[PDB]
Amino acid sequence: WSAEDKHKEGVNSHLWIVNRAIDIMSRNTTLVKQDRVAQLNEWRTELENGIYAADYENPYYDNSTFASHFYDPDNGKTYIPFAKQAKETGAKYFKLAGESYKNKDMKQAFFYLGLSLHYLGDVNQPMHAANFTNLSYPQGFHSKYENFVDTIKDNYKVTDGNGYWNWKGTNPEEWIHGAAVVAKQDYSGIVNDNTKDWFVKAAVSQEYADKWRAEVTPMTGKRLMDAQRVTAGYIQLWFDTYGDR
Ligand SMILES: [Zn+2]
Ligand SMILES: [Zn+2]
Ligand SMILES: [Zn+2]
Structure with missing residues (x-):
């Protein structure tokens, strides 16, 4: 997803997904401790820096190949043979964030958490x-x-407080893999012969530009809603793991 402005949602789908996930946590009045939301807002600059950094510098963008931003759940690989993929990379930053949080280095913790959220968002x-x-x-x-x-x-904002709490186990890799499984199932709702056809013809005809955009809208909304619910669950997992229990 896009991450072109560090602090603005307009052209940063990654930050929008995370901000909508935080809103799900705020709307939840049965399970979420609202001080967690206050901590994310207090260190929001660092969290946003981490969400943006993934697509803009090394090591995170893999020398402009973005290999670590991809992960196919069926074979466990990214698109470049032997490169690092999004599951091991997102899990690495989830654990580094937690270690920093335990040591009370909040700037480091929330930057690494933002990186991890980016990788989970990409799958x-x-x-x-x-x-x-x-x-x-x-x-x-x-x-x-x-x-x-x-x-x-x-x-496509989710407007209820129902994140996917304890969706997968306690291992963050299981969450990244599980989200990729669901997203790959929805792949043909976006990429298929028709959208390929219309995209190519869209260069000459405006009518075709509208056709592919309309065609991919329904599954795009579905994927964006799942991404918000999974992200909220994953943030709740992080605080449950490192937040003192
Ligand atoms: Zn992305
Ligand atoms: Zn992309
Ligand atoms: Zn990315």
Whole structure:
């Protein structure tokens, strides 16, 4: 998903997913301790820095190949043979964040948590769970799709307090894998012969630009709603794990 502005949701789908996940936690009045939400807001600059840094510098963006932002659940791999993938990378930063939190280094903790949230957010994008990059056929569709999502994402906010609490076990890798399983199932609702066809014809015809955008909207909304619920669960897991128990 996009992460083009550090502190603005307009062109940062990753930050929008996290902010909507925090709103789910705030809406929950049965299980969530609201001081957790206050801690995320207190260290929001560092959290947002971590969410943005993943797509912009080393080691996180893998020398501009973004290999660690992809993870196919069926084979456990990213799109480049032998490169690091999103499950081991997102789990690495979940644990580094927790160790920093226990040592009371909040700036370090929330930056590493933002990184981990970014990787979990990416495996909820079906193209990232299927190794479909901006060079895959049809080339340029991955990037135009992610730009398009920013223009519609406000229509898919989750407005209830039901995150996926304890969705998977206590291992963060299980959450990243589980989210990629669901996202790859939804891959054909976005990438298929029709959307490929219309995207290619969209260069010459505006009518086709609208056609592929409309076609991918329903599954995009579904994926964005699941990403908010899974992210809220994952933040709650992090505080349950390192927050003193
Ligand atoms: Zn992304
Ligand atoms: Zn992407
Ligand atoms: Zn990314």
